[PDB]
């Protein structure tokens, strides 16, 4: 069947792995174990149509930034994740989008701006600012919590819908 290569990118600690494992295994990862790179494949039904998700969970650690080229070339949709309590991670979003352009010649690839950890009371990134950033990119903004599962399916499934509608 049809397989979609989705890639989860963003700064250290924003919750890329927790989002991925919440989707794949319906489980919240409490501990922090830094990622180098991991992939997870799962069959899912989106809008009544079965497909295979191939999710690439990537390193926020800049030590591994050279990997970006490989996976940005073949990635078919991207979750650009920041944490709502981490303004630096929001600032970092642009760098991921720009690197995707270096290898795709464009940023014309399905992407979702993901503001994660929305279960936390303290927010340093304003919702209107995240909405405005997504608007400046022409992409959706979705608030998620890998802990409560809020918005998680919406974030990943929106990518698949955007690929299907090309």
């Amino acid at each position: 069947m049809t397989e979609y290569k989705l890639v989860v990118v963003g700064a250290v600690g924003v919750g890329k792995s927790a989002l991925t494992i919440q989707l794949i295994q319906n489980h919240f990862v409490d501990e922090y174990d830094p990622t180098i790179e991991d992939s997870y494949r799962k069959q899912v039904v989106i809008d009544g149509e079965t497909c295979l998700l191939d999710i690439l969970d990537t390193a926020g650690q800049e030590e591994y930034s050279a990997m970006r080229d490989q996976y940005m070339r073949t990635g078919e949709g991207f979750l650009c994740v920041f944490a709502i309590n981490n303004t630096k991670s929001f600032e970092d979003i642009h760098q991921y989008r720009e690197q995707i352009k270096r290898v795709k010649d464009s940023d014309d690839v399905p992407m979702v701006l993901v503001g994660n950890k929305c279960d936390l009371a303290a927010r340093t990134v304003e919702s209107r600012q995240a909405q405005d950033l997504a608007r400046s990119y022409g992409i959706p903004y979705i608030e998620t919590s890998a802990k409560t599962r809020q918005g998680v399916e919406d974030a990943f499934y929106t990518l698949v819908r955007e690929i299907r509608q090309h």
């Binding site: 494992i21 174990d33 830094p34 180098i36 790179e37 991991d38 992939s39 997870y40 191939d54 999710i55």
Partner: protein, 77 residues
Amino acid sequence: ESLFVRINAAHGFSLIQVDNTKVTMKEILLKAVKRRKGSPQYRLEKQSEPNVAVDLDSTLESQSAWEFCLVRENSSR
């Protein structure tokens, strides 16, 4: 960049950080199972030697390999 080993599993791959090549294959297996499956028995195989379980008490260095398959003991790669 740290050293790391590539683990090929039933539903994807995991890059497993190692501090040095004196780490045991048992330690690598436990890390890969924890990450990929969370809380069935498993073996590791050298990428270039299918169907043979590596000695989990041996060191990564002794394997002369940096890619392994994680296989359920009741199954094949």
